[PDB]
Amino acid sequence: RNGLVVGAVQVDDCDQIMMITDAGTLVRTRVSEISIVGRNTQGVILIRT
DNA sequence: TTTTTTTTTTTTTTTTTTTTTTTTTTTTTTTTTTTTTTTTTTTTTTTTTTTTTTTTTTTTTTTTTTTTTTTTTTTTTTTTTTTTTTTTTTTTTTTTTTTTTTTTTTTTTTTTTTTTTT
């Protein structure tokens, strides 16, 4: 897509754990995973960084 | 009374060795130069309610090319042996403790003599 290019990382997570992500240019963040709903292997949703 | 044999330290100066003055190469050391950390404030970035039109997932059906599949023969895997490196017992050496045995040096002050340089 215009926004999405290449799949990067896959992490298994429960419904109350956080996902910390990093960017190549000295940027990161810590997000709560409650606010995103599972979907069936075909879709694009929420931009977190 | 004269004359004859032998012994060594010196005229020794030259060969060998030792001692004493020298200066190339890898290991220290002071300097400048580049990586780190803490404050001000500062426009600037960034967190969080509300509305909104959107664009991707889930009713239902289709196929085809990746999922089925069996089998030959390779070739990575494992076995034994031996070498290289790592790591730890073993040994050796050295240092400190407190009473003993031994020693060794640097300068002032004056006055007189040797001992070199000009």
Side-chain angles (χ1 to χ4, degrees):
Chain A
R1 294 195 179 189
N2 301 327
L4 277 68
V5 180
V6 158
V9 153
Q10 278 195 340
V11 293
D12 187 8
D13 278 301
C14 308
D15 308 11
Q16 300 185 356
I17 303 176
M18 293 165 297
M19 187 175 186
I20 170 174
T21 175
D22 323 307
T25 56
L26 55 70
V27 174
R28 53 155 174 284
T29 174
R30 183 174 206 177
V31 170
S32 48
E33 299 181 49
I34 315 188
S35 60
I36 312 90
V37 193
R39 299 191 174 196
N40 307 9
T41 70
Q42 300 183 246
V44 184
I45 61 185
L46 205 71
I47 84 183
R48 301 204 211 177
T49 308

mmCIF file of all heavy atoms in Angstrom, chain A:
data_model
loop_
_atom_site.group_PDB
_atom_site.id
_atom_site.type_symbol
_atom_site.label_atom_id
_atom_site.label_comp_id
_atom_site.label_asym_id
_atom_site.label_seq_id
_atom_site.Cartn_x
_atom_site.Cartn_y
_atom_site.Cartn_z
ATOM 1 N N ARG A 1 0.835 -1.187 0.000
ATOM 2 C CA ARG A 1 0.000 0.000 0.000
ATOM 3 C C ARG A 1 0.879 1.248 0.000
ATOM 4 O O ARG A 1 2.110 1.177 0.063
ATOM 5 C CB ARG A 1 -0.939 0.000 1.207
ATOM 6 C CG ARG A 1 -1.975 -1.110 1.198
ATOM 7 C CD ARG A 1 -3.084 -0.823 2.201
ATOM 8 N NE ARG A 1 -4.109 -1.861 2.211
ATOM 9 C CZ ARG A 1 -5.269 -1.789 2.856
ATOM 10 N NH1 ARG A 1 -5.613 -0.722 3.564
ATOM 11 N NH2 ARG A 1 -6.110 -2.817 2.790
ATOM 12 N N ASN A 2 0.231 2.410 -0.094
ATOM 13 C CA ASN A 2 0.960 3.667 0.032
ATOM 14 C C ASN A 2 1.586 3.792 1.414
ATOM 15 O O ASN A 2 2.728 4.246 1.550
ATOM 16 C CB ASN A 2 0.025 4.843 -0.246
ATOM 17 C CG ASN A 2 -0.595 4.779 -1.628
ATOM 18 O OD1 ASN A 2 0.023 4.296 -2.576
ATOM 19 N ND2 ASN A 2 -1.825 5.264 -1.747
ATOM 20 N N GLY A 3 0.855 3.389 2.451
ATOM 21 C CA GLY A 3 1.372 3.412 3.803
ATOM 22 C C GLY A 3 2.233 2.210 4.131
ATOM 23 O O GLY A 3 3.294 2.351 4.744
ATOM 24 N N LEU A 4 1.792 1.028 3.707
ATOM 25 C CA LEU A 4 2.399 -0.239 4.094
ATOM 26 C C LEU A 4 3.268 -0.783 2.971
ATOM 27 O O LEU A 4 2.864 -0.770 1.804
ATOM 28 C CB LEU A 4 1.321 -1.261 4.457
ATOM 29 C CG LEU A 4 0.789 -1.159 5.888
ATOM 30 C CD1 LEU A 4 -0.007 0.124 6.114
ATOM 31 C CD2 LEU A 4 -0.039 -2.384 6.237
ATOM 32 N N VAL A 5 4.455 -1.278 3.340
ATOM 33 C CA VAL A 5 5.471 -1.714 2.383
ATOM 34 C C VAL A 5 5.849 -3.175 2.611
ATOM 35 O O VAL A 5 5.626 -4.019 1.736
ATOM 36 C CB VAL A 5 6.718 -0.810 2.460
ATOM 37 C CG1 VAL A 5 7.782 -1.276 1.459
ATOM 38 C CG2 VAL A 5 6.340 0.661 2.225
ATOM 39 N N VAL A 6 6.425 -3.483 3.776
ATOM 40 C CA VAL A 6 7.016 -4.791 4.052
ATOM 41 C C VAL A 6 6.662 -5.210 5.473
ATOM 42 O O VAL A 6 6.836 -4.439 6.421
ATOM 43 C CB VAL A 6 8.549 -4.758 3.836
ATOM 44 C CG1 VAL A 6 9.275 -5.872 4.600
ATOM 45 C CG2 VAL A 6 8.876 -4.882 2.354
ATOM 46 N N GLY A 7 6.190 -6.448 5.617
ATOM 47 C CA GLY A 7 5.920 -6.977 6.945
ATOM 48 C C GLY A 7 7.201 -7.119 7.746
ATOM 49 O O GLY A 7 8.222 -7.591 7.242
ATOM 50 N N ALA A 8 7.204 -6.645 8.999
ATOM 51 C CA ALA A 8 8.442 -6.572 9.814
ATOM 52 C C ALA A 8 8.489 -7.583 10.960
ATOM 53 O O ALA A 8 9.392 -8.424 10.931
ATOM 54 C CB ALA A 8 8.575 -5.174 10.362
ATOM 55 N N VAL A 9 7.614 -7.486 11.963
ATOM 56 C CA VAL A 9 7.716 -8.359 13.172
ATOM 57 C C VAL A 9 6.363 -8.949 13.572
ATOM 58 O O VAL A 9 5.345 -8.253 13.400
ATOM 59 C CB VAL A 9 8.318 -7.558 14.342
ATOM 60 C CG1 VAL A 9 7.883 -8.093 15.699
ATOM 61 C CG2 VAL A 9 9.831 -7.486 14.252
ATOM 62 N N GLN A 10 6.354 -10.181 14.084
ATOM 63 C CA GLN A 10 5.130 -10.835 14.611
ATOM 64 C C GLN A 10 5.371 -11.158 16.086
ATOM 65 O O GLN A 10 6.409 -11.780 16.371
ATOM 66 C CB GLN A 10 4.825 -12.121 13.846
ATOM 67 C CG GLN A 10 4.101 -11.894 12.530
ATOM 68 C CD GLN A 10 3.501 -13.173 12.000
ATOM 69 O OE1 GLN A 10 3.895 -14.274 12.379
ATOM 70 N NE2 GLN A 10 2.537 -13.032 11.107
ATOM 71 N N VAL A 11 4.473 -10.754 16.987
ATOM 72 C CA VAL A 11 4.598 -11.042 18.448
ATOM 73 C C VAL A 11 3.254 -11.557 18.968
ATOM 74 O O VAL A 11 2.228 -10.939 18.633
ATOM 75 C CB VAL A 11 5.066 -9.797 19.224
ATOM 76 C CG1 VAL A 11 6.490 -9.413 18.857
ATOM 77 C CG2 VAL A 11 4.132 -8.616 19.023
ATOM 78 N N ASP A 12 3.254 -12.640 19.751
ATOM 79 C CA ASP A 12 2.014 -13.196 20.358
ATOM 80 C C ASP A 12 1.712 -12.381 21.616
ATOM 81 O O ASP A 12 2.660 -12.143 22.388
ATOM 82 C CB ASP A 12 2.146 -14.691 20.652
ATOM 83 C CG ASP A 12 0.854 -15.335 21.125
ATOM 84 O OD1 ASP A 12 -0.188 -14.652 21.089
ATOM 85 O OD2 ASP A 12 0.900 -16.514 21.525
ATOM 86 N N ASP A 13 0.462 -11.961 21.819
ATOM 87 C CA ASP A 13 0.102 -11.081 22.960
ATOM 88 C C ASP A 13 -1.315 -11.347 23.458
ATOM 89 O O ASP A 13 -2.186 -11.619 22.618
ATOM 90 C CB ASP A 13 0.224 -9.613 22.563
ATOM 91 C CG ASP A 13 1.646 -9.092 22.632
ATOM 92 O OD1 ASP A 13 2.233 -9.154 23.727
ATOM 93 O OD2 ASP A 13 2.154 -8.637 21.590
ATOM 94 N N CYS A 14 -1.543 -11.219 24.766
ATOM 95 C CA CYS A 14 -2.845 -11.380 25.395
ATOM 96 C C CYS A 14 -3.632 -10.078 25.246
ATOM 97 O O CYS A 14 -3.236 -9.169 24.513
ATOM 98 C CB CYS A 14 -2.670 -11.793 26.854
ATOM 99 S SG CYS A 14 -1.597 -13.230 27.081
ATOM 100 N N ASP A 15 -4.756 -9.969 25.954
ATOM 101 C CA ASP A 15 -5.676 -8.849 25.813
ATOM 102 C C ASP A 15 -5.407 -7.707 26.791
ATOM 103 O O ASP A 15 -6.207 -6.766 26.848
ATOM 104 C CB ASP A 15 -7.113 -9.340 25.985
ATOM 105 C CG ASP A 15 -7.433 -10.518 25.092
ATOM 106 O OD1 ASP A 15 -6.491 -11.080 24.495
ATOM 107 O OD2 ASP A 15 -8.622 -10.880 24.984
ATOM 108 N N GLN A 16 -4.315 -7.771 27.576
ATOM 109 C CA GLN A 16 -3.973 -6.706 28.515
ATOM 110 C C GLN A 16 -2.477 -6.401 28.554
ATOM 111 O O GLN A 16 -2.039 -5.636 29.421
ATOM 112 C CB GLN A 16 -4.443 -7.067 29.930
ATOM 113 C CG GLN A 16 -5.941 -7.288 30.059
ATOM 114 C CD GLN A 16 -6.369 -7.514 31.496
ATOM 115 O OE1 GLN A 16 -5.538 -7.576 32.401
ATOM 116 N NE2 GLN A 16 -7.675 -7.637 31.712
ATOM 117 N N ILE A 17 -1.703 -6.938 27.602
ATOM 118 C CA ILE A 17 -0.223 -6.729 27.526
ATOM 119 C C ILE A 17 0.077 -5.607 26.529
ATOM 120 O O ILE A 17 -0.780 -5.354 25.665
ATOM 121 C CB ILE A 17 0.493 -8.032 27.127
ATOM 122 C CG1 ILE A 17 0.176 -9.173 28.096
ATOM 123 C CG2 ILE A 17 1.991 -7.805 26.994
ATOM 124 C CD1 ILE A 17 0.782 -10.497 27.699
ATOM 125 N N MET A 18 1.249 -4.971 26.629
ATOM 126 C CA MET A 18 1.639 -3.843 25.743
ATOM 127 C C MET A 18 2.594 -4.341 24.657
ATOM 128 O O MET A 18 3.124 -5.454 24.822
ATOM 129 C CB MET A 18 2.316 -2.736 26.554
ATOM 130 C CG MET A 18 1.376 -2.043 27.518
ATOM 131 S SD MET A 18 2.251 -1.070 28.766
ATOM 132 C CE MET A 18 3.153 -2.370 29.607
ATOM 133 N N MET A 19 2.690 -3.592 23.557
ATOM 134 C CA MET A 19 3.608 -3.870 22.428
ATOM 135 C C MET A 19 4.462 -2.612 22.356
ATOM 136 O O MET A 19 3.860 -1.536 22.260
ATOM 137 C CB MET A 19 2.814 -4.071 21.138
ATOM 138 C CG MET A 19 3.629 -4.524 19.952
ATOM 139 S SD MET A 19 2.534 -4.844 18.547
ATOM 140 C CE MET A 19 3.695 -5.521 17.363
ATOM 141 N N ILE A 20 5.801 -2.783 22.603
ATOM 142 C CA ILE A 20 6.766 -1.652 22.481
ATOM 143 C C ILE A 20 7.369 -1.789 21.091
ATOM 144 O O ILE A 20 7.702 -2.917 20.725
ATOM 145 C CB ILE A 20 7.847 -1.647 23.582
ATOM 146 C CG1 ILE A 20 8.954 -0.635 23.275
ATOM 147 C CG2 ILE A 20 8.422 -3.036 23.811
ATOM 148 C CD1 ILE A 20 9.965 -0.470 24.385
ATOM 149 N N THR A 21 7.429 -0.676 20.310
ATOM 150 C CA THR A 21 7.965 -0.770 18.927
ATOM 151 C C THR A 21 9.102 0.239 18.770
ATOM 152 O O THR A 21 9.166 1.164 19.597
ATOM 153 C CB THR A 21 6.852 -0.558 17.896
ATOM 154 O OG1 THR A 21 7.447 -0.538 16.598
ATOM 155 C CG2 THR A 21 6.073 0.719 18.122
ATOM 156 N N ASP A 22 9.967 0.070 17.765
ATOM 157 C CA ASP A 22 11.137 0.961 17.545
ATOM 158 C C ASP A 22 11.184 1.418 16.088
ATOM 159 O O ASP A 22 10.617 0.708 15.243
ATOM 160 C CB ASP A 22 12.442 0.248 17.886
ATOM 161 C CG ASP A 22 12.325 -0.683 19.076
ATOM 162 O OD1 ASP A 22 11.865 -0.219 20.137
ATOM 163 O OD2 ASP A 22 12.672 -1.868 18.922
ATOM 164 N N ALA A 23 11.829 2.550 15.803
ATOM 165 C CA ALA A 23 12.000 3.081 14.432
ATOM 166 C C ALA A 23 13.499 3.236 14.190
ATOM 167 O O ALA A 23 14.216 3.480 15.177
ATOM 168 C CB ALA A 23 11.278 4.390 14.285
ATOM 169 N N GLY A 24 13.968 3.125 12.947
ATOM 170 C CA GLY A 24 15.390 3.166 12.661
ATOM 171 C C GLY A 24 16.082 4.460 13.043
ATOM 172 O O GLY A 24 17.302 4.480 13.223
ATOM 173 N N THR A 25 15.316 5.542 13.181
ATOM 174 C CA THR A 25 15.831 6.890 13.424
ATOM 175 C C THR A 25 15.670 7.304 14.880
ATOM 176 O O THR A 25 15.193 8.405 15.160
ATOM 177 C CB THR A 25 15.146 7.896 12.502
ATOM 178 O OG1 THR A 25 13.726 7.833 12.683
ATOM 179 C CG2 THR A 25 15.491 7.606 11.050
ATOM 180 N N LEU A 26 15.984 6.405 15.818
ATOM 181 C CA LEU A 26 16.038 6.700 17.259
ATOM 182 C C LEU A 26 14.671 7.121 17.804
ATOM 183 O O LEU A 26 14.541 8.098 18.541
ATOM 184 C CB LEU A 26 17.132 7.740 17.591
ATOM 185 C CG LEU A 26 17.369 9.166 17.024
ATOM 186 C CD1 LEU A 26 16.322 10.195 17.449
ATOM 187 C CD2 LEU A 26 18.745 9.675 17.422
ATOM 188 N N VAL A 27 13.646 6.339 17.466
ATOM 189 C CA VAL A 27 12.272 6.585 17.896
ATOM 190 C C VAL A 27 11.676 5.266 18.366
ATOM 191 O O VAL A 27 11.922 4.220 17.757
ATOM 192 C CB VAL A 27 11.416 7.192 16.764
ATOM 193 C CG1 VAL A 27 9.960 7.293 17.185
ATOM 194 C CG2 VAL A 27 11.937 8.565 16.356
ATOM 195 N N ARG A 28 10.911 5.312 19.458
ATOM 196 C CA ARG A 28 10.159 4.153 19.935
ATOM 197 C C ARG A 28 8.874 4.614 20.615
ATOM 198 O O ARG A 28 8.550 5.803 20.583
ATOM 199 C CB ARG A 28 11.019 3.307 20.880
ATOM 200 C CG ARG A 28 11.639 4.066 22.028
ATOM 201 C CD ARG A 28 11.934 3.143 23.187
ATOM 202 N NE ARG A 28 12.670 3.822 24.247
ATOM 203 C CZ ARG A 28 13.963 4.126 24.208
ATOM 204 N NH1 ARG A 28 14.719 3.846 23.155
ATOM 205 N NH2 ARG A 28 14.516 4.733 25.255
ATOM 206 N N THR A 29 8.132 3.682 21.216
ATOM 207 C CA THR A 29 6.842 3.986 21.884
ATOM 208 C C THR A 29 6.342 2.743 22.619
ATOM 209 O O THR A 29 6.832 1.652 22.295
ATOM 210 C CB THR A 29 5.799 4.456 20.865
ATOM 211 O OG1 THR A 29 4.548 4.592 21.539
ATOM 212 C CG2 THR A 29 5.648 3.504 19.699
ATOM 213 N N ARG A 30 5.426 2.894 23.576
ATOM 214 C CA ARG A 30 4.824 1.759 24.322
ATOM 215 C C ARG A 30 3.309 1.909 24.238
ATOM 216 O O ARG A 30 2.812 2.909 24.778
ATOM 217 C CB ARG A 30 5.301 1.770 25.772
ATOM 218 C CG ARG A 30 4.806 0.601 26.608
ATOM 219 C CD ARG A 30 5.454 0.639 27.976
ATOM 220 N NE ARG A 30 5.543 -0.671 28.602
ATOM 221 C CZ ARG A 30 6.121 -0.906 29.773
ATOM 222 N NH1 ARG A 30 6.667 0.085 30.459
ATOM 223 N NH2 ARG A 30 6.155 -2.132 30.260
ATOM 224 N N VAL A 31 2.602 0.971 23.604
ATOM 225 C CA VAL A 31 1.130 1.095 23.377
ATOM 226 C C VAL A 31 0.382 -0.016 24.112
ATOM 227 O O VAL A 31 0.922 -1.131 24.179
ATOM 228 C CB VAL A 31 0.806 1.065 21.872
ATOM 229 C CG1 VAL A 31 -0.687 0.935 21.617
ATOM 230 C CG2 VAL A 31 1.367 2.282 21.153
ATOM 231 N N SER A 32 -0.808 0.271 24.642
ATOM 232 C CA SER A 32 -1.669 -0.748 25.296
ATOM 233 C C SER A 32 -2.421 -1.477 24.184
ATOM 234 O O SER A 32 -2.980 -0.777 23.320
ATOM 235 C CB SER A 32 -2.589 -0.121 26.303
ATOM 236 O OG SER A 32 -3.238 1.017 25.755
ATOM 237 N N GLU A 33 -2.452 -2.811 24.189
ATOM 238 C CA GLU A 33 -3.031 -3.579 23.096
ATOM 239 C C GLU A 33 -4.527 -3.819 23.247
ATOM 240 O O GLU A 33 -5.082 -4.649 22.521
ATOM 241 C CB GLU A 33 -2.310 -4.919 22.974
ATOM 242 C CG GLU A 33 -0.838 -4.792 22.680
ATOM 243 C CD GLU A 33 -0.172 -6.137 22.554
ATOM 244 O OE1 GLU A 33 -0.709 -6.993 21.822
ATOM 245 O OE2 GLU A 33 0.876 -6.343 23.200
ATOM 246 N N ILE A 34 -5.197 -3.115 24.160
ATOM 247 C CA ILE A 34 -6.630 -3.333 24.330
ATOM 248 C C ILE A 34 -7.394 -2.742 23.149
ATOM 249 O O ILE A 34 -8.425 -3.285 22.736
ATOM 250 C CB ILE A 34 -7.127 -2.749 25.674
ATOM 251 C CG1 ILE A 34 -6.183 -3.112 26.838
ATOM 252 C CG2 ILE A 34 -8.549 -3.261 26.015
ATOM 253 C CD1 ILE A 34 -6.709 -2.745 28.220
ATOM 254 N N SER A 35 -6.905 -1.639 22.578
ATOM 255 C CA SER A 35 -7.674 -0.822 21.647
ATOM 256 C C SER A 35 -7.649 -1.337 20.203
ATOM 257 O O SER A 35 -8.031 -0.576 19.303
ATOM 258 C CB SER A 35 -7.160 0.619 21.693
ATOM 259 O OG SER A 35 -5.789 0.680 21.342
ATOM 260 N N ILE A 36 -7.218 -2.574 19.953
ATOM 261 C CA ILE A 36 -7.136 -3.142 18.609
ATOM 262 C C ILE A 36 -7.757 -4.532 18.647
ATOM 263 O O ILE A 36 -7.442 -5.332 19.535
ATOM 264 C CB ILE A 36 -5.683 -3.202 18.091
ATOM 265 C CG1 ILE A 36 -4.966 -1.859 18.312
ATOM 266 C CG2 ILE A 36 -5.661 -3.552 16.600
ATOM 267 C CD1 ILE A 36 -4.225 -1.720 19.648
ATOM 268 N N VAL A 37 -8.623 -4.817 17.674
ATOM 269 C CA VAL A 37 -9.419 -6.039 17.628
ATOM 270 C C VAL A 37 -8.825 -6.973 16.586
ATOM 271 O O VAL A 37 -8.341 -6.526 15.540
ATOM 272 C CB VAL A 37 -10.895 -5.730 17.305
ATOM 273 C CG1 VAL A 37 -11.777 -6.949 17.580
ATOM 274 C CG2 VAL A 37 -11.368 -4.510 18.095
ATOM 275 N N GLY A 38 -8.865 -8.273 16.872
ATOM 276 C CA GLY A 38 -8.323 -9.245 15.944
ATOM 277 C C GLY A 38 -9.117 -9.306 14.653
ATOM 278 O O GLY A 38 -10.316 -9.033 14.616
ATOM 279 N N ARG A 39 -8.419 -9.654 13.569
ATOM 280 C CA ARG A 39 -9.007 -9.742 12.237
ATOM 281 C C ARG A 39 -8.367 -10.904 11.485
ATOM 282 O O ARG A 39 -7.307 -11.406 11.862
ATOM 283 C CB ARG A 39 -8.846 -8.422 11.471
ATOM 284 C CG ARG A 39 -9.540 -7.258 12.160
ATOM 285 C CD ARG A 39 -9.631 -6.020 11.304
ATOM 286 N NE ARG A 39 -10.438 -4.994 11.961
ATOM 287 C CZ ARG A 39 -10.968 -3.928 11.371
ATOM 288 N NH1 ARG A 39 -10.810 -3.689 10.077
ATOM 289 N NH2 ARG A 39 -11.679 -3.074 12.102
ATOM 290 N N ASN A 40 -9.026 -11.320 10.402
ATOM 291 C CA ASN A 40 -8.796 -12.637 9.800
ATOM 292 C C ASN A 40 -7.800 -12.577 8.636
ATOM 293 O O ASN A 40 -8.128 -12.841 7.480
ATOM 294 C CB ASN A 40 -10.123 -13.233 9.346
ATOM 295 C CG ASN A 40 -11.158 -13.266 10.454
ATOM 296 O OD1 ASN A 40 -10.952 -12.704 11.530
ATOM 297 N ND2 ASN A 40 -12.282 -13.918 10.193
ATOM 298 N N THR A 41 -6.558 -12.221 8.961
ATOM 299 C CA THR A 41 -5.372 -12.398 8.119
ATOM 300 C C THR A 41 -5.380 -11.579 6.825
ATOM 301 O O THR A 41 -4.473 -11.744 6.004
ATOM 302 C CB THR A 41 -5.148 -13.878 7.757
ATOM 303 O OG1 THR A 41 -6.166 -14.327 6.856
ATOM 304 C CG2 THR A 41 -5.150 -14.751 9.001
ATOM 305 N N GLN A 42 -6.369 -10.709 6.602
ATOM 306 C CA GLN A 42 -6.414 -9.875 5.397
ATOM 307 C C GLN A 42 -7.022 -8.534 5.807
ATOM 308 O O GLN A 42 -8.242 -8.404 5.925
ATOM 309 C CB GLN A 42 -7.220 -10.529 4.284
ATOM 310 C CG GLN A 42 -6.704 -11.875 3.819
ATOM 311 C CD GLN A 42 -7.513 -12.429 2.668
ATOM 312 O OE1 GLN A 42 -8.182 -13.454 2.802
ATOM 313 N NE2 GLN A 42 -7.457 -11.754 1.525
ATOM 314 N N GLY A 43 -6.165 -7.554 6.028
ATOM 315 C CA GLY A 43 -6.625 -6.230 6.386
ATOM 316 C C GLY A 43 -5.499 -5.379 6.916
ATOM 317 O O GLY A 43 -4.419 -5.863 7.254
ATOM 318 N N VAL A 44 -5.771 -4.078 6.980
ATOM 319 C CA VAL A 44 -4.852 -3.084 7.520
ATOM 320 C C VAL A 44 -5.647 -2.192 8.460
ATOM 321 O O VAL A 44 -6.709 -1.682 8.086
ATOM 322 C CB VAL A 44 -4.187 -2.252 6.405
ATOM 323 C CG1 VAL A 44 -3.158 -1.291 6.991
ATOM 324 C CG2 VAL A 44 -3.553 -3.171 5.360
ATOM 325 N N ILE A 45 -5.135 -2.011 9.678
ATOM 326 C CA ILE A 45 -5.837 -1.305 10.748
ATOM 327 C C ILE A 45 -4.856 -0.605 11.681
ATOM 328 O O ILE A 45 -3.681 -0.985 11.730
ATOM 329 C CB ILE A 45 -6.507 -2.295 11.726
ATOM 330 C CG1 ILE A 45 -5.481 -3.208 12.413
ATOM 331 C CG2 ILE A 45 -7.535 -3.135 10.992
ATOM 332 C CD1 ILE A 45 -6.108 -4.285 13.285
ATOM 333 N N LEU A 46 -5.308 0.491 12.309
ATOM 334 C CA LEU A 46 -4.516 1.324 13.265
ATOM 335 C C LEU A 46 -3.052 1.536 12.865
ATOM 336 O O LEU A 46 -2.331 0.555 12.739
ATOM 337 C CB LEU A 46 -4.572 0.673 14.651
ATOM 338 C CG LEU A 46 -4.359 1.649 15.806
ATOM 339 C CD1 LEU A 46 -5.565 2.562 15.950
ATOM 340 C CD2 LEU A 46 -4.092 0.920 17.107
ATOM 341 N N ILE A 47 -2.606 2.786 12.720
ATOM 342 C CA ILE A 47 -1.158 3.082 12.500
ATOM 343 C C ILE A 47 -0.652 3.463 13.891
ATOM 344 O O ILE A 47 -1.167 4.449 14.434
ATOM 345 C CB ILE A 47 -0.940 4.174 11.431
ATOM 346 C CG1 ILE A 47 -1.057 5.593 11.993
ATOM 347 C CG2 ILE A 47 -1.882 3.956 10.257
ATOM 348 C CD1 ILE A 47 -0.926 6.674 10.949
ATOM 349 N N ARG A 48 0.273 2.705 14.485
ATOM 350 C CA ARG A 48 0.658 2.958 15.905
ATOM 351 C C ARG A 48 1.925 3.810 16.031
ATOM 352 O O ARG A 48 2.163 4.301 17.150
ATOM 353 C CB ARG A 48 0.779 1.617 16.634
ATOM 354 C CG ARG A 48 -0.514 0.816 16.616
ATOM 355 C CD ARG A 48 -0.610 -0.171 17.758
ATOM 356 N NE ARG A 48 -1.372 -1.352 17.381
ATOM 357 C CZ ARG A 48 -1.561 -2.409 18.160
ATOM 358 N NH1 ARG A 48 -1.049 -2.441 19.379
ATOM 359 N NH2 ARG A 48 -2.275 -3.431 17.720
ATOM 360 N N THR A 49 2.688 4.027 14.960
ATOM 361 C CA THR A 49 3.845 4.915 15.013
ATOM 362 C C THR A 49 3.840 5.704 13.708
ATOM 363 O O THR A 49 4.386 5.245 12.701
ATOM 364 C CB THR A 49 5.139 4.138 15.204
ATOM 365 O OG1 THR A 49 5.013 3.267 16.333
ATOM 366 C CG2 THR A 49 6.305 5.080 15.450
#
